[PDB]
């Protein structure tokens, strides 16, 4: 530190060992990442293998109950628990680990440990980039998965009545969450979600295009028919003709990148921006501030029985989703709805 | 397909972040880093 | 520093960035106009 | 509504377009 005496302490020894290059880099961020991520992943696997959701949701959700990988989930606690942190020492479980598993505390365990593991992994990105003297754009890009996780698994249930309405960690439970947002929020109609979908699909397009453009604008650089052997990592010159790529895409699509920098950034920028827009939309949904209806079209439909649009059709479909989903999906509401109030079409 | 679109977003962001993180210093802080790349330059603009 | 401010910097916006900004503004208007008119 | 949304859309079009055009015309005259 600036040719100063810098007498060593235990911190210097700890940093020397933590930042030593091994098969798994630990660093100072490892002390947060590895335990939290390990506990989150292991808790999800443990819950999907052994832990039931029979008392919080009235559902079988583990392999030991007969579920498969698609239908097993670590499920959210009961809605009457609200936004309780569900500590195993907490006033609900009170130290009983088995009843803590039965009460849905494993969901809070997995969610909180996964959140702190995401923080630790972002700190790991920062620490490794600082160790190797690279710019921290990987962590800047990883900010968008963390924004999505925070808004979806924490902010949305915190805005709702309890962790019950958070997504349950599992395949079919995520599908439940998706169909719930459709029926109850009209989340497809939300412009923030539309921007998120545009970002995700444009990023997938950018990945595919790029990769194809690089692989098809390669310089020869060899003699064999396998081009993958014609690249050396220490090679100084480019492997692909940027000029030919630009010519091809300008003459095919009308526009092309001319700057490699700008292209890689754009590939960074599109999915991160899309995920951040979708996170803002989910924050809006946390307060039921939905983009659910177009009021002028609802007025025209109420005053005109001929007027039908696909938007009106989707409103009808959402009403059907809510009515046929509510009794089984929100048991705390205790909805014993007679079939004669369920909206139906004809015959079918 | 969902894994493909999510992975395409993930891998686009990662490529991207990686290329962008390993950009060779050719500009100053008052310029755009993209100005460090010239159209048709022979040399690689990043440290693979 | 001196009588002139030494921190003078010149802002730049090329035509590609102009096209990107115009596209962003008009596409945001297209996307959000239905919701604003409601 | 019919006219408040109209002025909102017009302002959201024009003010950022004005900003972008200022910067672009300044740049293009510079180069």
């Amino acid at each position: 530190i600036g040719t100063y005496q810098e007498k060593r302490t235990w911190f210097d020894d700890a940093d020397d060992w933590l930042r030593q290059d091994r098969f798994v880099f630990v660093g100072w961020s490892g002390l947060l990442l590895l335990p939290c991520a390990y506990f989150a992943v292991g808790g999800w696997l443990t819950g999907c293998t052994f832990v039931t959701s029979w008392y919080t949701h009235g559902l079988a959700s583990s392999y030991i109950e007969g579920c498969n990988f698609l239908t097993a989930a670590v499920s959210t606690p009961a809605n009457s628990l609200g936004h309780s942190l569900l500590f195993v020492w907490g006033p609900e479980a009170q130290g009983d680990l088995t009843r803590w598993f039965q009460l849905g505390g494993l969901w809070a365990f997995v969610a909180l440990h996964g959140a702190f593991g995401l923080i630790g992994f972002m700190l790991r990105q920062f620490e490794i980039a600082r160790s190797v003297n690279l710019r921290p754009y990987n962590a800047i890009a990883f900010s968008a998965p963390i924004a999505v996780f925070v808004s979806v698994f924490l902010i949305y249930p915190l805005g709702q009545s309890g962790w019950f309405f958070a997504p349950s960690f599992g395949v079919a439970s995520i599908f439940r969450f998706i169909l719930f947002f459709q029926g109850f929020h009209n989340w497809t109609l939300n412009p923030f979600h539309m921007m998120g979908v545009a970002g995700v699909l444009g990023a997938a397009l950018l990945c595919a295009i790029h990769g194809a453009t690089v692989e098809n604008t390669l310089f020869e650089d060899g003699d064999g028919a396998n081009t993958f052997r014609a690249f050396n990592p220490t090679q100084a010159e480019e492997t692909y003709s940027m000029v030919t790529a630009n010519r091809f895409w300008s003459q095919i699509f009308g526009v092309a990148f001319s700057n490699k920098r700008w292209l890689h950034f754009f590939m960074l920028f599109v999915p991160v921006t899309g995920l951040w827009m979708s996170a803002l939309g989910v924050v809006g949904l946390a307060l039921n501030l939905r983009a659910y209806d177009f009021v002028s079209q609802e007025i025209r439909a109420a005053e005109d029985p001929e007027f039908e649009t696909f938007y009106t059709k989707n409103i009808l479909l959402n009403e059907g989703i809510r009515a046929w989903m509510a009794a089984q999906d929100q048991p705390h509401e205790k909805l014993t709805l007679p079939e004669e109030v369920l909206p139906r079409g004809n015959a079918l | 397909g969902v894994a493909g679109v999510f992975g395409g977003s993930l891998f686009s962001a990662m490529h991207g972040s990686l290329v962008t993180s390993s950009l060779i210093r050719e500009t100053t802080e008052n310029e755009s880093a993209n100005a460090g790349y010239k159209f048709g330059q022979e040399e690689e603009t990043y440290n693979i | 520093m001196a009588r002139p401010n030494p921190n003078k910097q010149v802002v730049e916006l090329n035509r590609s960035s102009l096209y990107w900004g115009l596209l962003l503004i008009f596409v945001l208007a297209v996307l959000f106009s239905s919701y604003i008119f409601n | 509504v019919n006219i408040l949304g109209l002025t909102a859309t017009a302002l959201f079009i024009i003010i950022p377009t004005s900003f972008l055009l200022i910067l672009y015309v300044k740049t293009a005259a510079s180069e």
Binding site: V243, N246, S250, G254, V255, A256, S258 | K38, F39, G40 | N14, R15, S16, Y19, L22, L23, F26, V27, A29, V30, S33, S34, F37 | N2, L6, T9
Partner: peptide, 30 residues
């Protein structure tokens, strides 16, 4: 009225596309 706004916005977007294609800043190879 609103149909005019929608059509104007779409046509202006297409005009921006037209200009970005045919009046782009040309990629200079030096």
């Amino acid at each position: 009225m609103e149909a005019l706004v929608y059509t104007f916005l779409l046509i202006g977007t297409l005009g921006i596309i037209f200009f970005s294609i045919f009046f782009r800043e040309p990629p200079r190879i030096a």
